[PDB]
Design a binder for this molecule. Structure first.
Ligand SMILES: COc1ccccc1-n1c(=O)c2cnc(Nc3ccc(N4CCN(C)CC4)cc3)nc2n1-c1cccc(C(C)(C)O)n1
Length: 260
């Protein structure tokens, strides 16, 4: 087995329908990696389409400080293995749960740092004519200075010929639900604003109802902290009902509010 020959498992860090992810040490280089091992996808399934989107994204994207580094992928007896960089801080979703437990959240300066770093990753992905389509706290990984990195490329698609799989309804822009895929980079921007709102300590985002529609009308959810007006206006314009009004990732990373 290449997996057992080249690596030693150190800690299970993920489990679910996607299979299992372990923190491993590679024997040859002594470095730590995150390795996902999953069953061969069933033909015609969403799992198969996600695996195809991920292989394409891994071949197209280069190394970027704010995208989880991809190293290798191989098959072992009807199981697929993917070796990525290990981010020692876990996901932003788990960092948010830990903050909730200690009655805390990311303060304003930390939220602007998160928004800018994830924005730099999105600038790179979008510059490669791709969209992520699944930005959310569980797909942002942390390396600890703190570095935020986008992970889980399974929903990555091409702007020129988009194939949009089911997204997380809590982070889904209205125009994507309407099957309008002409401004997909702006669906990533909308999801990023809601990811930052989660990091700010908001209540669990709704999946439907009056509250889901209220957010899609351009109204930010409540957060248990006061943010500056320059920052709140940036979050509010990122969820505008008109995607053309939301900032591009290029505009977002040049914003003096985040840079300062
Ligand atoms: C090989 O990898 C991946 C392959 C596909 C998609 C995403 C990942 N993927 C990365 O690329 C990644 C990089 N770094 C980390 N670091 C980490 C450190 C600690 C923890 N903690 C430990 C302590 N526990 C109490 C809680 C969890 C969790 C993660 N994890 C990673 N991943 C990962 C891990 C779990 C789940 C998932 C998905 C598939 C998204 O569901 N992906």
């Amino acid at each position: 087995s290449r997996y057992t020959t080249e690596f030693h498992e150190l800690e299970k860090i993920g489990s679910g329908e996607f299979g299992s992810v372990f923190k491993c040490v590679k024997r040859l280089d002594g470095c730590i990696y995150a390795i996902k091992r999953s069953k061969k996808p069933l033909a015609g399934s969403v799992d198969e389409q996600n695996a195809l989107r991920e292989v394409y994204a891994h071949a197209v994207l280069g190394q970027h400080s704010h995208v989880v580094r991809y190293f290798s992928a191989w098959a072992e007896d009807d199981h697929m293995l993917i070796q990525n960089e290990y981010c020692n801080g876990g996901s932003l979703a788990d960092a948010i749960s830990e903050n909730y437990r200690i009655m805390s959240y990311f303060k304003e300066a930390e939220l602007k740092d998160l928004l800018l770093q994830v924005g730099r990753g999105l600038r790179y992905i979008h510059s490669m004519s791709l969209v992520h389509m699944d930005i959310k706290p569980s797909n942002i990984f942390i390396s600890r200075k703190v570095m935020f990195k986008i992970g889980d490329l399974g929903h990555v698609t091409r702007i020129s010929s988009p194939q949009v799989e089911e997204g997380d309804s809590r982070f889904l822009a209205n125009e994507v639900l309407q099957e309008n895929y002409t401004h997909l980079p702006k669906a990533d921007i909308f999801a990023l604003a809601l990811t930052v709102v989660c990091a700010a300590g908001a209540e669990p985002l709704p999946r439907n109802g009056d509250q889901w529609h209220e957010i899609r009308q351009g109204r930010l959810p409540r957060i248990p902290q006061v943010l500056s007006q320059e920052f709140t206006e940036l979050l509010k314009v990122m969820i505008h009902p008109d995607p053309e009004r939301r900032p591009s990732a290029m505009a977002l990373v040049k914003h003096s509010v985040l840079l300062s």
